[PDB]
């Protein structure tokens, strides 16, 4: 309802070690600039999960907020021969990256942030698995999966991948199969927690609750229109604040309302809150929910 797609709470950064060329218009990510690792997330018909969940945090924003660790190496070079740690999972992942791209980030089995990079001046193919030769190139990365996370510290290392009736999926080995293993590249959900591996899913049960954290509310000004105003300069209940700000029941229920003495209108983020998931009948707080097109080998015989 509210056109708040480019408004990214927290730090709002989109850069990785090795592709810091877009640091001028990527740190932070405001309403202006041309970030190649953020435009494709707003195109209609690509990743609607981020469109419905705009008031959240991506993988790069999670890495910048000390949530998701970085793999080793963070940028897997596609030029060195004899393979490299970033092929056994990329080759079994059917992706599709547009033209004029160099790096491509994705989630690995260890829960860290992986990324492939081509040496200059090369580009990626139609799927982003290999590199090839070609105008200019988009100095950035392309999201290969459809995942999202948030700020939390919920533990979940005692939960692994279930998937009843599935031989081997992605790079994990659930069981030793020997019969007719049906192989088909399909989309698979996943919700990586904290200090855990890539835990796949079968059915999705997400819930949304109202959050009272400062990173879930907006506050704009009206100049002589709208204006980006930081909510950190707002007063508290029984405390003291530098600037003033008004709002509705969700804003005044946690902060302080000054009626006409305010200079910025605040409201709740349309599509935020605490989103929990149901795993094994327990409503845990996930940290990486999304889809990924990988290899699905179902037991046929």
Partner 1 sequence: DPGCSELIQASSRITTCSTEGVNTKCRLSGTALIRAGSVGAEACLMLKGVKEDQTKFLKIKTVSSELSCREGQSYWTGSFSPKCLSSRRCHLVGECHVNRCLSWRDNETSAEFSFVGESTTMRENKCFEQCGGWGCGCFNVNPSCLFVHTYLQSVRKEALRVFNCIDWVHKLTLEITDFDGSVSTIDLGASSSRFTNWGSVSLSLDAEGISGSNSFSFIESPGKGYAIVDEPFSEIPRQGFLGEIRCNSESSVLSAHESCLRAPNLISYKPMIDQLECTTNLIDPFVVFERGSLPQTRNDKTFAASKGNRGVQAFSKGSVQADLTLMFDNFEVDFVGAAVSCDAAFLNLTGCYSCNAGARVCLSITSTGTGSLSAHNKDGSLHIVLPSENGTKDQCQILHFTVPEVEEEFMYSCDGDERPLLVKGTLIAID
Residues engaged in binding partner 1 (CB under 8 A): 1, 47-49, 51-52, 146, 164-165, 175-176, 182-184, 187, 203-210, 248-250, 268, 270-271, 273-274, 278, 281, 283, 291, 299-301
Residue whose CB is less far from a copy of itself, 68 or 294: 294
Residue 82 CB, nearest distance to a copy of itself (Å)? 8
Q: How many CA atoms lie within 13 A of 7 on its CB side?
A: 21
Residue 55 CB, nearest distance to a copy of itself (Å)? 21
H helix runs in 153-278, sequence order = 249-252
* 225 interacts with, out of a copy of itself, partner 1, none, CB within 5 to 8 A per kind: a copy of itself
Percent helix, strand, coil in the chain, to 5, is: 10, 30, 60
Residue whose CB is less far from a copy of itself, 25 or 125: 125
What CA–CA distance (Å, rounded) separates 291 from 301? Answer: 27
Residue 185 CB, nearest distance to partner 1 (Å)? 11
Binding site for a copy of itself (CB under 8 A): 78-79, 81-83, 87, 91, 125, 129-134, 222-225, 246, 258-262, 265
* 258 interacts with, out of a copy of itself, partner 1, none, CB within 5 to 8 A per kind: a copy of itself
What dihedral angle (degrees, nearest 10) is formed by the CA atoms of 119, 124, 125, 129?
A: 80
Residue 215 CB, nearest distance to partner 1 (Å)? 15
Residue 246 CB, nearest distance to a copy of itself (Å)? 8
Q: Distance of alpha carbon 215 from its chain centroid, rounded?
A: 16
Q: How many CA atoms lie within 13 A of 200 on its CB side?
A: 22
* 131 interacts with, out of a copy of itself, partner 1, none, CB within 5 to 8 A per kind: a copy of itself
Q: Under 8 Å CB-to-CB from 123, ≥6 apart: which residues? A: 99, 100, 101, 102, 131, 132, 133, 134, 137
Q: Under 8 Å CB-to-CB from 154, ≥6 apart: which residues? A: 193, 194, 284, 285, 286, 287
Contact 103, 140 (CB under 8 A): yes
What CA–CA distance (Å, rounded) separates 3 from 202? Answer: 32
Residue 183 CB, nearest distance to a copy of itself (Å)? 10
Residue 250 CB, nearest distance to a copy of itself (Å)? 14
Residue whose CB is less far from a copy of itself, 61 or 168: 168
Contact 287, 193 (CB under 8 A): yes
Residue whose CB is less far from a copy of itself, 209 or 225: 225
What CA–CA distance (Å, rounded) separates 249 from 262? Answer: 15
* 209 interacts with, out of partner 1, a copy of itself, none, CB within 5 to 8 A per kind: partner 1
* 130 interacts with, out of a copy of itself, partner 1, none, CB within 5 to 8 A per kind: a copy of itself
Residue 1 CB, nearest distance to partner 1 (Å)? 6
Residue whose CB is less far from a copy of itself, 131 or 181: 131
Q: What is the DSSP string of 69-107?
A: -B-SSSSEESSSSS--TTSTTTTTB-----SSEEEEEEE
Q: Distance of alpha carbon 109 from its chain centroid, rounded?
A: 16
* 283 interacts with, out of a copy of itself, partner 1, none, CB within 5 to 8 A per kind: partner 1
């Amino acid at each position: 309802e509210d056109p708040h797609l480019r408004n990214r709470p927290g730090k709002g950064h989109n850069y990785i070690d090795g592709m810091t060329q877009e640091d001028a218009t990527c740190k932070p990510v405001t309403y202006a600039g041309a970030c190649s690792s953020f435009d494709v997330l707003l195109e209609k018909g690509k990743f609607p999960l981020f469109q419905s969940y705009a008031h959240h945090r991506t993988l790069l924003e999670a890495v910048h907020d000390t949530i998701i660790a970085k793999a080793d190496p963070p940028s897997c070079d596609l030029q060195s021969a004899h393979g490299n740690p970033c092929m056994k999972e990329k080759l079994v992942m059917k992706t599709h990256c547009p033209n004029d791209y160099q790096s491509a980030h994705y989630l690995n089995n260890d829960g860290k942030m992986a990324s492939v990079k081509c040496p200059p001046k090369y580009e990626l193919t139609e799927d982003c698995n290999f590199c090839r030769q070609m105008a200019s190139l988009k100095k950035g990365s392309y999201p290969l999966q459809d995942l999202f996370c948030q700020s939390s510290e919920d533990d979940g290392s005692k939960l692994k991948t279930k998937m009843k009736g599935v031989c081997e999926v992605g790079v994990q080995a659930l069981k030793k199969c020997d019969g007719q293993l049906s192989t088909a590249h399909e989309v698979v959900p996943f919700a990586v927690f904290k200090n855990s591996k890539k835990v796949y899913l079968d059915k999705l049960d997400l819930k949304t609750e109202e959050n009272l954290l400062p990173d879930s509310f907006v506050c704009f000004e009206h100049k002589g229109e709208l204006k980006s105003f930081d909510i950190s300069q707002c007063p508290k209940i029984g405390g003291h604040g530098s600037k003033k700000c008004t709002g509705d029941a969700a804003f005044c229920s946690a902060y302080e309302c000054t009626a006409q003495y305010a200079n910025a209108y605040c409201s709740h983020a349309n599509g935020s809150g605490i989103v929990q998931i149901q795993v094994s009948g327990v409503w845990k707080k996930p940290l990486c929910v999304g889809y990924e097109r990988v290899v699905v080998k179902r037991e046929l015989s």
